[PDB]
């Protein structure tokens, strides 16, 4: 004899239906908009006669049950746990079941895997017809229930400024099953006060949102202050249910669709250099069937001191032709989609969550893929013995110095750009010949894709 209120609901995400412990189940902090259920299909058989005194009667049959629908919203709350000292988001298994179809392994390098610097999610291993399989456990007041064999259909993230960073999850399950007995003690599995304090120490505010967009075909970075946006991770999962005329049926298995990583970004038109107006004019002047943009949406902002942040990186993105949104202040919309280099390659994009992002950390996350792996920032090329010039028929094996000293990729390539008076090899052994009386240049760039420039103008002469 009791009424059940929605405010007392508690959600646990599990990968096992028995043997529930702290590594298989954790509570998911949900909000008011939580919803779940399961709909049923039916049919009416009616006789349609034409004569006088016709039969006017119907009949209903239950024929099938639809896939269970569930949805809830959670705050993006990166933090570091005391047990492992690795940055982790509380709803990490949700990210894993969204990202890959293999067993969860935070020590690995695919799907949801963490580190001593940041928590990372990449979609390099999502080529599966059935992604990682969860079981949502619902606790309303006293009664228990759960959805059997769920799959993460999508994860909506709305960049709504003057609001907190939040993600909305949606999915489907085979069947919603009400449980009379307690599966596991929610007091122990549920998050305790210490980790709650640690989490609430780190919040992501959508207002402090910087965006980094670069045209890979022209090497043009734009300065676009955002007004509002959203990006989605969608699986297009469809649940199959068998058709049996004699008995009602529930869905039996599913099949993932096409993985889509789209987005939409609204901003005001700026007349300044490399502003929104320049991007819009370039996009509507080129009129190209395909675009290669690098988009790095950085929720929570970038700062020298440690700040929480959630970052979406699209290496090779596709940007639609923008349109002007006539409001009281003129604006625009930059709708993009992260496409892979090859269809069966994955790597459409990745995400990095942490409560400790210095600007260098997010920079090397963007250019190297991991916040811990350092990346080169600047280069000044060095000759063989501090030499400033060269004469005809003389070698010059030039070297390189890089910063920082702990960058993972310390190598560079070699090229000649301005002038035709010398040639360089893979190692850097520049070679010249006679009849070389012009000023020639030499260049070097790193192999990690940082975008670092090494230049030197050597004054090659005809000799004494």
């Amino acid at each position: 004899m009791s009424l059940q209120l929605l405010r007392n609901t508690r959600i646990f995400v599990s990968t096992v239906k028995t043997g529930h412990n702290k590594t298989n189940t954790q509570e998911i902090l949900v909000q008011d908009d939580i919803s779940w259920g399961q709909d049923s299909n039916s049919t009416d058989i009616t006789v349609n006669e034409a004569g006088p005194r016709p039969t006017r009667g119907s009949k209903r049959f239950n024929d099938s049950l639809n896939a269970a629908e569930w949805s809830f919203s959670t705050y993006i709350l990166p933090y570091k746990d005391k047990n492992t000292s690795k940055q982790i988001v509380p709803d990490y298994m949700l990210w894993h079941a969204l990202s890959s179809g293999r067993a969860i392994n935070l020590e690995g390098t695919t799907g949801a895997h963490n580190n001593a610097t940041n928590f990372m999610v990449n979609f390099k291993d999502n080529s599966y017809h059935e992604l990682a399989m969860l079981h949502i456990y619902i606790l309303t007041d006293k009664t228990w229930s759960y959805i059997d064999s769920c799959q993460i259909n999508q994860a909506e993230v709305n960049v709504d400024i003057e609001d907190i960073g939040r993600v909305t999850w949606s999915g489907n399950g085979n069947q919603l099953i009400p449980l009379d007995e307690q599966p596991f003690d929610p007091d122990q599995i549920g998050i305790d006060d210490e980790t709650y304090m640690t989490i609430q120490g780190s919040y992501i505010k959508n207002k402090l949102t910087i965006l980094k967009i670069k045209d890979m075909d022209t090497n043009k970075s734009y300065d676009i202050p955002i007004t509002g946006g959203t990006f989605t991770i969608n699986n297009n999962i469809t649940y199959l249910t068998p058709n049996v005329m004699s008995r009602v049926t529930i869905p039996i298995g599913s099949f993932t669709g096409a993985f889509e990583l789209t987005g939409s970004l609204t901003a005001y038109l700026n007349d300044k250099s490399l502003g929104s107006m320049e991007l819009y004019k370039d996009l509507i002047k080129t009129l190209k069937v395909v675009n290669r943009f690098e988009i790095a949406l950085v929720l929570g902002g970038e700062y020298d001191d440690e700040r929480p942040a959630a970052i979406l990186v699209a290496k090779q993105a596709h940007v639609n032709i923008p349109t002007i949104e006539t409001d009281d202040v003129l604006g625009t919309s930059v709708e993009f989609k992260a496409i892979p280099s090859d269809l069966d390659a994955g790597d459409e994009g990745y995400l990095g969550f942490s409560s400790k992002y210095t600007r260098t950390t997010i920079n090397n996350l963007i250019v190297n893929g991991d916040g811990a792996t350092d990346a080169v920032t600047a280069i000044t090329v060095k000759s063989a013995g501090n030499v400033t010039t060269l004469n005809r028929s003389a070698t010059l094996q030039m070297s390189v110095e890089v910063t920082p000293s702990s960058a993972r990729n310390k190598e560079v390539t070699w090229a000649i750009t301005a002038g035709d008076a010398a040639t360089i090899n893979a190692t850097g052994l520049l070679r010249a010949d006679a009849s070389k009386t012009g000023a020639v240049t030499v260049e070097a760039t790193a192999k990690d894709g940082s975008g670092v420039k090494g230049t030197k103008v050597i004054t090659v002469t005809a000799g004494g």
Partner: protein, 298 residues
């Protein structure tokens, strides 16, 4: 200039020197065309590319009219013209076809500004209507031999169709025992004539138009759709066995097609709700098929 709208038209059938303007016309469709003799005389001398085409005949036209039932029962003249014998307001299907050639009549399709298309040597070749839960309408099909464009015409000011008859649910009986669970009673009557092409060498360099035709056969048919209903286990009245001879009548408040003796074939479909379908034709020695036309109050 003057465009020609179908909605702004008037169809008048000219028979016996009187114009039967068939109002209450839901929709009609017609076409005109010519026959060509196109041969390509490719020779070893000249493998030509240009054909030798001459227009020498008018392809017979196929005009279809959809006419609502009316209180003045002008539409029964289509049965009258198609060959049925008349007694009062009831049309009989004769045991034998009366004449070799059908009853020929001309038809006009009037339009504004003295525009007209004149179909000649027409005969009614098909009449079928479905008694159903929608308003009944009989689609007549006539075939013409010669079409022409004329300036003045015949317009049926007086002979016209009255108000459309109100809907009334159909019911099919055996003697006086109703047949339960009716769905759609469709009746079909035909005069399957054939054109006698007599294009000869005296018509060379001239356009030929069909003029004479002969009746291959007349028939009355009906397809009845029911729901498979049984009242008893091993019922005798309602089953799937064929019925060599049984009196049938597809009755309405304004029309009643009577088969004094009928040959019924049944067909069961295992659809969402089981449906049986009849195929009613009159027997060999059956009395003439009746078609009564009741205007109002029977």
């Amino acid at each position: 200039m003057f465009y020609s709208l179908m909605r702004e038209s008037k169809i008048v059938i000219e028979y016996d020197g009187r114009g039967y303007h068939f109002d209450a016309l839901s929709n009609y469709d017609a076409s005109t065309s010519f026959q060509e003799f196109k041969t390509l005389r490719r020779t070893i001398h000249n493998r030509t590319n240009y054909a030798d085409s001459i227009i020498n005949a008018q392809d017979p036209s196929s005009i279809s009219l959809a006419i609502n039932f009316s209180t003045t029962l002008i539409e029964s003249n289509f049965f009258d013209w198609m060959g049925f014998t008349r007694e009062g307001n009831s049309l009989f299907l004769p045991r034998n076809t009366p004449n070799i050639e059908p009853i020929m009549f001309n038809m006009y399709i009037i339009n504004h500004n003295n525009s007209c298309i004149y179909f000649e040597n027409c005969y009614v070749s098909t009449v079928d209507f479905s008694l159903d839960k929608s308003i009944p309408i009989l689609n007549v099909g006539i075939e013409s031999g010669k079409f022409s464009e004329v300036s003045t015409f015949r317009d049926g000011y007086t002979i016209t169709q009255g108000e459309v008859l109100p809907y009334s649910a159909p019911a099919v009986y055996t003697n006086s025992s109703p047949l339960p669970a009716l769905i759609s009673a469709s009746m079909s009557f035909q005069q399957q004539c054939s054109w006698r092409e007599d294009r000869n060498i005296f018509d060379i360099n001239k356009i030929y138009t069909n003029k004479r035709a002969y009746v291959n056969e007349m028939n009355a048919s009906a397809t009845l759709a029911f729901y498979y209903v049984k009242r008893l286990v091993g019922d005798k009245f309602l089953n799937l066995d064929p019925e060599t001879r049984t009196p049938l009548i597809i009755k309405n408040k304004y029309v009643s097609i009577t088969f004094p003796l009928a040959r019924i074939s049944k067909r069961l479909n295992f659809s969402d709700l089981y449906q049986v379908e009849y195929d009613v034709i009159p027997t060999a020695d059956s009395d003439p098929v009746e078609i009564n036309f009741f205007g109002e109050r029977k």
